[PDB]
Amino acid sequence: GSAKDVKFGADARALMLQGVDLLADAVAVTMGPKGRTVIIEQSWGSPKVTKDGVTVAKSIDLKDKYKNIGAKLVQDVANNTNEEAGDGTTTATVLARSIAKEGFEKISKGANPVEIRRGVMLAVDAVIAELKKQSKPVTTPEEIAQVATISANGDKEIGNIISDAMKKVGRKGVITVKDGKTLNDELEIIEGMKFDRGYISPYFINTSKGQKCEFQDAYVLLSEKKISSIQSIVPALEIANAHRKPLVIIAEDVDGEALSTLVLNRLKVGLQVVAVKAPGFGDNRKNQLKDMAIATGGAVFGEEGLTLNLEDVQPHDLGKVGEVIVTKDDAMLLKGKGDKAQIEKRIQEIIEQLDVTTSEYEKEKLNERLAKLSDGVAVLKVGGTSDVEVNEKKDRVTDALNATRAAVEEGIVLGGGCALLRCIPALDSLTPANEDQKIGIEIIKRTLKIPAMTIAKNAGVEGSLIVEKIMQSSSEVGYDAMAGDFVNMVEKGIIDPTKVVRTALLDAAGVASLLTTAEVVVTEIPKE
Amino acid sequence: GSAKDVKFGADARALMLQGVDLLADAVAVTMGPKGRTVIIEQSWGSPKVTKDGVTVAKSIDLKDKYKNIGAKLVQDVANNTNEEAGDGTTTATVLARSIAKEGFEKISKGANPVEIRRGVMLAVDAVIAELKKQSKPVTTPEEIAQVATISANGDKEIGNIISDAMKKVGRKGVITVKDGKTLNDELEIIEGMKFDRGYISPYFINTSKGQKCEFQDAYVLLSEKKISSIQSIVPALEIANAHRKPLVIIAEDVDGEALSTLVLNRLKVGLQVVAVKAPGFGDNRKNQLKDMAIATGGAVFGEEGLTLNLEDVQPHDLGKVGEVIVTKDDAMLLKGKGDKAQIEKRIQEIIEQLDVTTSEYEKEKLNERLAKLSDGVAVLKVGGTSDVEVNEKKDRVTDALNATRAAVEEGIVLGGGCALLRCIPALDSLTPANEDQKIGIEIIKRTLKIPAMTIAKNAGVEGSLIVEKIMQSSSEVGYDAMAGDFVNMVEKGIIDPTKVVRTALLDAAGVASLLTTAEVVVTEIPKE
Amino acid sequence: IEIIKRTLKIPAMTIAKNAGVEGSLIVEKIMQSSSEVGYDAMAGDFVNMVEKGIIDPTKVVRTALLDAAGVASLLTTAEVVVTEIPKE
């Protein structure tokens, strides 16, 4: 194989701890208010200016192999916390460094690091079982705004924007962030059924306005496969002209022959029609056209095992929509007379379909179909002047959004580190089975103080003194590091998701208590 | 990944500030009259000789990684200002260096850089809200000449040329600058409907002059697709010969058969005809031929839905034009009897079509159609003797043109830096919420003096003394650095667009106040 | 004469500079003021001098000016410089 190099004991431990200390000192400055950004050189363009604890962690890679091992084992913690909770990365990294440092001190010749790991895991379980006891659900719409404000680095505009977007879409709706172009932030609630696809021929525009085809009380002809010939298209247009109502033709495509017939009828005698293609690549459109049909009320033509053809249509076989807008890039149906008692059955079908499976993309478009059929979708356009500002503010907005979505499902708990400091009395009743589990419980009991200490440190005050005066205080009092004083929390409005706190703690403890059990380190020699 | 290197605190700040200072000292010499060019080595040919603050900024790239980070964060400022306003790059870069320098001095252990950023942004908002109050619209045609003269580095010929081009085309017309060939500048006003495409066969020339086909009161046959056979071409020529008038044949192309028929009828019986291909290369031609038709009055043949076959034409189906000139590379129709009441509807259609969308190329050809259909288009052929002279003078002309186009939409304000010096009393009423926002407001209050100071510095006098004696003076008095004395501004004729001033200030403040919040810098190893 | 007229402003400028303020602005506002008014860089404001108690010997001022001007105006007259090689 490749020439390798082994290091034993305290040397390898010291190098791994140096790497962890470097990668955790680079990120620990970002914590809390008064924390500070980190400029990462991008290999091609302008650099990133971050405050998150994964970009700062996923970027830092060390030259030395052992320091690099430490850096990788901390990046694993940061990335696991990011994926599992969306937030809690800096806290996870500082907890990991604390458990690693406290781990490479009790490893004597008689100490059993595996039993120390077992004690650490008992302590982590006993503390995440206390977080769930001191937690409380988020009910009022002010708590959502508060969580969004806090997780947005104290940006109250972000909090109000996210709270508004969650009031008009639902606490489990579909909010999404985009690179805005204006100077401020904007909340755009796409309402009704909208798909990113416009009319085919630019002759259907009857608006004398901003390039729109606008219909009221229109019919809908939903075709799965192409409408090629003049034969298939004529009966639907006959029905439309006889009833004297506009017609939208949502199909896979309108061939040049039927297209020519439609445009011809438009420019002369003036049947009111407009045509558009399907929303989704192959399979998604198959379900999405059916959703549109049952939302407006009708039948998709050309289905595989249904045997419905265009040649035999009827006025009760076409969908009915109150208002239709078709621009050059997107079509919006608004008021579908689609027998709500059945669209509700469809909604139950799709919610069960999400509850069954998960692929991070099937569930994505699945939730898209929920929101596109029940209550809109919100989009947050982040204001900014350059790309680096927009990227930083968009990262903060996505973090606040992940936090607000992690609070509504698993409750809130006190913030500023107090959620963990208020769990030390839980560890003070554990009876360790032996000396090693006692050592692990003590490691966790020390590590639970790291977050409040690091926040007070970044605030420019003495951390340990603040943590002590907090633990001496009541249960609802703690430290506001912006005002810099002791306040009630829920009255003042500092809270955090229990999910993010518990996932950060658990991931940090898990990776660090396994790093601390090492005795030999094997690294490939660097050739050049 | 790649082996990286992290630097913390004052070291990283010092290196990034060195990079910013280098990239801003290279560009600060270019400011104002008495400012000086910069010779940039081109990798392939003769070097550039610039005075703009983006070529000098986009060129400079530093060896060291941290200096390079500073240089990139200043290039972003210059480039954003260039894209958003077309001018204001040197000012934006000097403001960015001032804000960065004033930012890397107040960062003590207790100072909160994010609150300093917030205070800086409040100050920038309060000052751009004062620029808009002390502004005033540009109304007389002498203010346009003045703005063009000033932004052209005080070249009055450029100002008069741009003012003339804007009087004969409209303040929102289509002016464009080209590399001239003569020694002087030239204003060429392409009038009527002209497209860069000449006759097909060199037998239609009936001029006995400079290779031109010249018709008076001619018919126009507009065909979307090719005219292949003699069958389709014969009836139009029958109508033309019967009425005894010339005929122009604007089609996608003239096949060899109809072409041979045309050339034969031209050479043997001397029938007056001339043929040309369509102007638009692709989809654009389908709209441009329709525009030409409605401008002259007729129907484009071969349209998809408006079938209108060539075989059934009539004398009212052909366009009519007063004068036609067709050379070997361009055709010009001049006086189209096109029922102006309908071409006005077309103009409204195309103006709404620009108001709807934006792609930097669809809007480009869109405005091209507006100008080519309403009041022609002006071109500015810049003189010069070598390519480097022509390039420098062309850059100055494009900057003067961008300035004049940014002044006519958002008003003018005093110049020489006085626009910003007259905004400090606005900052003198801000009540900062805390100490950090107060620090930010003070940073902006110091930064607002940088432009007048740098101009007086380049003029060879004491900057700060000039700025002080300006602030002591009245509201309309300021410093003329060419005459070198204090004068009224609008009376003497120094003004700048409020858009360029506000965009430069806002972009500089935005990028600099985010650079100043950094605590750690991560850069890839320079390996080789 | 113009070189000396520019050089006479250097001391007040350097004092205002070390005090953390703008030197040239202070020198200008001093030259605009009366003959007994000047700048106190500790209190940082304009005061009468003998009333406030700032004075210097004319001997030290004149000797400093004369020695500086003398050596500098001879340094500025050079055209060639000859230096021993730095061998090792």
Ligand SMILES: Nc1ncnc2c1ncn2[C@@H]1O[C@H](COP(=O)(O)OP(=O)(O)O)[C@@H](O)[C@H]1O
């Ligand atoms: N005013 C505040 N006072 C005390 N703690 C705060 C305050 N604002 C935010 N925090 C705490 O800082 C953390 C949120 O920001 P941050 O330090 O970046 O953590 P993360 O890396 O997980 O996003 C939470 O622990 C939060 O409770």
Ligand SMILES: Nc1ncnc2c1ncn2[C@@H]1O[C@H](COP(=O)(O)OP(=O)(O)O)[C@@H](O)[C@H]1O
């Ligand atoms: N005679 C003048 N006197 C004072 N300021 C002037 C004069 N001419 C131009 N300026 C100022 O110089 C700037 C225009 O040229 P320049 O310094 O290169 O700025 P930019 O890089 O944005 O083009 C403006 O601030 C303008 O007000």
Ligand SMILES: [Mg+2]
């Ligand atoms: Mg967070």
Ligand SMILES: [Mg+2]
């Ligand atoms: Mg300019």
